[PDB]
């Protein structure tokens, strides 16, 4: 129970962040995504005293007037909040509060050894619904704003200051060098306290096998089956799917005509490879929105089911020519599709349509 002088806080062995809970569309507000246990060395020089002394460890957040959802201070990443608490010797978890004054969260019996530890729990909390979360990785590097984390090691007469109360910091400087000044952490430093790695990012992508080909057989149809322009063959159903998707992945898919580069007068009509049938095209219908796909590069959202994302599709021949224009033959078309997470620029696959326009039934 000696007097503490010249306090300083120093980093211990730094732990990696751990996943308390998995982020999911099902994750509730207030859930703890990540947590880390931090241990700091508290060093001071003892000097003998007649009266018993205590080292009172205090904390408070300054630079913001009031706390955020779930006792958090806003993180640089929106919808994710930072909360830090001390694992007190009395066996109580106490969160450092947002207040103008520091609060007494722990005490340490003073000793000549001049060495002790301060123990904390770091927590990253979801303050919004997962859908509400921003696009991108979501890595947390810093607290938002000017908010600063203050740790106070303060020497006091044993038992004079109550735990859980505002921590009074004496006006006096004796004995010269008494422990009174704060340790203030700003921005990434508050997040990076105690050393160790930065929080991990959240994955937002599905697994894409590049060069994937899909073949759809439209079959053979006689010209007599398309009496009027805008008439179509029987629909063929197919699905374009992605698997091993991250919980919060929301990918999109875009299509281009393999044979046409310029913007089409009507991009709902996919072109046939030339030297075959004439006056016909292919139409593909989006199962979700119920509208025909445009093959100009418009991106389409995909449905999410379990770990996979898919777009349900159906395809058919459509008659575009007037009476003179129709010709029979091989009817083949191709659509290149790209996925954006958004993270794709290269073509990621092709859909091949094959079939025939025949004269005789």
Residue numbers in the entry: 3 to 363
Task: Quote the study on this structure.
In this paper we describe the crystal structure of the tip adhesin CupB6.
The crystals belong to C2 space group and the asymmetric unit consists of eight molecules composed from two up-down-up-down tetramers. Each molecule consists of two domains comprising a putative tip adhesin (residues; 1–202) and the pilin domain (202–343). The pilin domain conforms to the classical Ig-like fold of other chaperone-usher pilin domains with a C-terminal β strand (strand G), provided by the NTE of CupB1 located at the C-terminus. Five alternating residues comprising glycine or large hydrophobic residues from the self-complementing G strand (G351, V353, F355, G357 and I359) are positioned to interact with the five pockets of the subunit groove. The adhesin domain of CupB6 is 205 amino acid residues in length and is significantly larger than typical adhesion domains of the chaperone-usher family, which are usually between 150 and 180 residues. Adjacent to this is a shorter sequence (17LPWR19) that also adopts PPII helical secondary structure despite containing only one central proline.
